[PDB]
Each structure stands twice: as structure tokens, then as C-alpha cells.
Design a protein around this ligand. Structure first.
Ligand SMILES: OC[C@H]1O[C@H](OC[C@H]2O[C@H](OC[C@H]3O[C@H](OC[C@H]4O[C@H](O)[C@@H](O)[C@@H](O)[C@@H]4O)[C@@H](O)[C@@H](O)[C@@H]3O)[C@@H](O)[C@@H](O)[C@@H]2O)[C@@H](O)[C@@H](O)[C@@H]1O
Length: 339
């Protein structure tokens, strides 16, 4: 079984176990049919991964049923009070539009982009708010994805205003939430009792992952070497022993939201690994890091059926949330893409 076949087996198991009403995916493989908007946005990204790997046109109807189901199970609308939810679906919509030219995806993305920009304010000097409800909380997870969103939109529409947005968001993110020594990414800045407080304890895989993804896309959009340097510094900190790994493997971040975090990192990490201006030596290091994570999950973390747990070193003994399964599928599709 080569890495493409492993990826296809995890795509099949995910669809089989989690497919529910309206072509959307359920919260867990046990008693929870809750609709989780951003988790289903990452399921769309996973189906696109399968389509790109296979060229199999049977993915396209699955993608379209999921796009339409999200609107139904979110209450017959695409708006969400969580701004990052709208950013993650926007990214998947523009990715699909680039591959299929299906205008329905572009129209949903255009809507979600207007809502995302409304979240920007000069509180803490910039940044998109986490929620339409929490305008003091500026979070890495509502900024890194907004920069990626703007860069995908720039690739499609070639409007200078979208590149301006990407640069402004990235500049604020790097000036506020990026460790200048490591290039790892702090979770948020918020007010408490008159003080601006940065949460430096919460260093999560997906926040450094979207910073790496934005930096990689900015390098490709501008040619400015500072962006590729930033991406390489952050990625080198992900591979070197430290906060995000245990025994050379991306660490257990629990289930729920945290279950998706590692998958997002692997996706953009892998995109940096495919940048043709990346030095050959760094490319070998990054490709080997992805392979050892993929091998670890395949041999030690996956159940016989092909469900991944939060710990890629251990099989899960009970419930597996969709988020956790998606991280597993994203890892295998990234490995298959590097082959
Ligand atoms: O114990 C808290 C939390 O800790 C870790 O996550 C860190 C994370 O928390 C915050 O954001 C969570 C997500 O918010 C948005 O999704 C909204 C989504 O949340 C749940 O899935 C449900 O309530 C859904 O109904 C709802 O729509 C979005 O921004 C997403 O990207 C976020 O991850 C926030 O403080 C972040 O800055 C921070 O990174 C994990 O252990 C987690 O499982 C845990 O609950």
C-alpha cells in the first residue's frame, strides 16, 4: 500500500463513518449528530485533496452536496458569529473555484470575504476579531486564515486591494503574536482590566501553520525574500525539538477543535516544502518530518478501520471526533502529495 492508497482508504472510512444529513459530516462516530461549521469546512478541504490526487470526478458531487449542506445546517445562511469559521470555508471555496471554475463557490467566498474584513479594527493596533461578539480579542486563528483567504482571492481576481489586505494582516500578526526568536505563534491578544495581555502559553500547531501558509503565499505573490525567510524560520522551529513535538511527532492537542490543529499545520508546512525557492536541504528535512509523522500514525495511531486519534502515537480507544479524523486524512494526503 503506497501513500496514495493509504490516503484513499482514510477518505473512504471518513465518508462512510461521518456522512450524515444534507451531505454534511457528523461531529463524532458515536452519539453526536451536531453540525460543526468549521470542521465541515475542513472536510471540504479534504475532499479537494482527494480530487487533486486522483482526478476522480466522483469527488465533485460530494464537494457540492457539502457546500450546500453547510448552508442548510447553519440555519439557511453562510454567516457565522465565529469569523475564523467563515475564513476557513472561504479558503476551501476559492481552492475549489481555482480547480473547477464553479461560480457557486466563488459567490459564497465573496460573501465570506466581506464579513471577514468587517472584523478588522485598530484595537491592539489591528487584527481581525475572533467573533463579531468579541472585538477586543484578536486571535492568530482569525488572522492567519484571513491572510491566506486574501492571497487566494488575489491569485483569482488580481485586485491590489486583496494583496494590501494580506500584507496588513500578516504585518500585524508578525508584529503582535509571533515570537521573534522561534517564529512560533502566540494564540491571541485581548484586554483584561486595562492591560493588553498576550497568551504566550497557548502555542498551537495550527496557528504557526497558518502563519507559515500566509508567509509562503506572500512570497509567491510578491517575491519578497523576507516572507520565505519567516516561513523557513517558523517551519525549522516546528521540526526542531520543542513545544509542538514529542519524540519527533506533532503532539497530542486533544479532541474537539484541537483535533483539527495538526492537520492544518501539515497542510501548509507541506505547501512550504513544495515552494521551488526552498533550499534543497530544508526540503529534505521537511519531507522527512512529514514522512515520520505519517509512518507513526499509520503504524501506531490508526485503528484497523482507519480512524485516527488525537495522539498519532496511540490508537484511540473510544469516541473519535470528525476534527481528529480530518487531521489524520490531511497528514496522509500531504504525504501522498510529497511523493
Ligand atoms: O479549552 C479551550 C479550547 O482549547 C483549544 O483551542 C484553542 C482555541 O480556542 C478558541 O477557538 C476555538 C475555535 O473557535 C472557532 O470555532 C468556533 C467553533 O468552536 C467549536 O467547534 C464549537 O463551539 C463550534 O460551534 C464553533 O462554531 C474558530 O476560531 C476555530 O478555528 C477555533 O479553534 C480560541 O481561543 C483560539 O484562539 C484558540 O486557539 C482546544 O483544546 C479546544 O479543543 C478547546 O476547546
Amino acid at each position: 500500500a503506497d501513500w496514495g492508497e493509504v490516503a484513499e482508504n482514510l477518505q473512504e472510512q471518513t465518508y462512510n463513518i461521518y456522512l450524515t444529513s444534507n451531505g454534511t459530516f457528523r461531529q463524532d462516530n458515536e452519539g453526536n449528530e451536531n453540525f460543526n461549521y468549521w470542521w465541515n469546512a475542513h472536510m471540504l478541504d479534504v475532499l479537494i485533496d482527494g480530487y487533486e490526487r486522483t482526478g476522480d470526478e466522483s469527488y465533485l458531487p460530494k464537494m457540492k452536496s457539502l457546500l450546500e449542506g453547510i448552508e442548510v445546517r447553519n440555519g439557511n445562511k453562510y454567516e457565522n458569529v465565529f469569523i475564523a469559521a467563515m475564513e476557513w470555508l472561504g479558503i476551501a471555496c476559492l481552492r475549489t473555484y481555482k480547480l473547477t471554475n464553479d461560480q457557486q463557490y466563488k459567490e459564497v467566498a465573496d460573501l465570506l470575504w466581506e464579513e471577514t474584513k468587517q472584523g478588522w479594527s485598530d484595537v491592539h493596533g489591528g487584527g481581525i476579531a475572533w467573533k463579531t461578539d468579541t472585538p477586543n480579542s484578536k486571535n492568530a486563528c482569525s488572522n492567519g486564515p484571513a491572510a491566506i483567504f486574501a492571497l487566494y482571492l488575489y491569485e483569482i481576481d488580481q485586485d491590489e486591494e486583496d494583496l494590501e489586505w494580506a500584507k496588513k494582516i500578516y504585518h500585524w500578526l508578525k508584529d503582535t503574536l509571533v515570537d521573534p526568536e522561534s517564529g512560533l505563534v502566540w494564540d491571541n491578544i485581548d484586554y483584561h482590566d486595562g492591560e493588553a495581555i498576550i497568551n504566550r502559553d497557548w502555542i498551537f500547531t495550527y496557528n504557526v501553520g497558518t502563519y507559515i501558509g500566509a508567509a509562503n503565499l506572500l512570497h509567491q505573490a510578491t517575491g519578497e525574500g523576507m516572507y520565505l525567510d519567516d516561513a523557513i524560520k517558523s517551519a525549522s522551529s516546528v521540526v526542531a525539538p520543542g513545544e509542538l513535538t514529542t519524540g519527533g511527532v506533532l503532539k497530542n492537542e486533544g479532541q474537539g477543535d484541537g483535533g483539527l490543529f495538526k492537520g492544518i499545520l501539515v497542510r501548509y508546512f507541506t505547501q512550504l516544502a513544495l515552494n521551488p525557492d526552498l533550499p534543497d536541504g530544508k526540503r529534505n528535512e521537511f519531507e522527512e518530518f512529514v514522512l515520520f509523522n505519517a509512518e507513526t500514525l499509520y503504524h501506531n495511531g490508526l485503528t484497523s478501520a482507519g480512524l485516527a486519534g488525537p495522539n498519532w502515537n496511540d490508537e484511540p480507544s473510544g469516541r473519535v471526533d470528525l476534527s481528529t479524523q480530518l487531521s489524520g486524512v490531511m497528514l496522509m494526503e500531504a504525504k501522498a502529495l510529497l511523493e
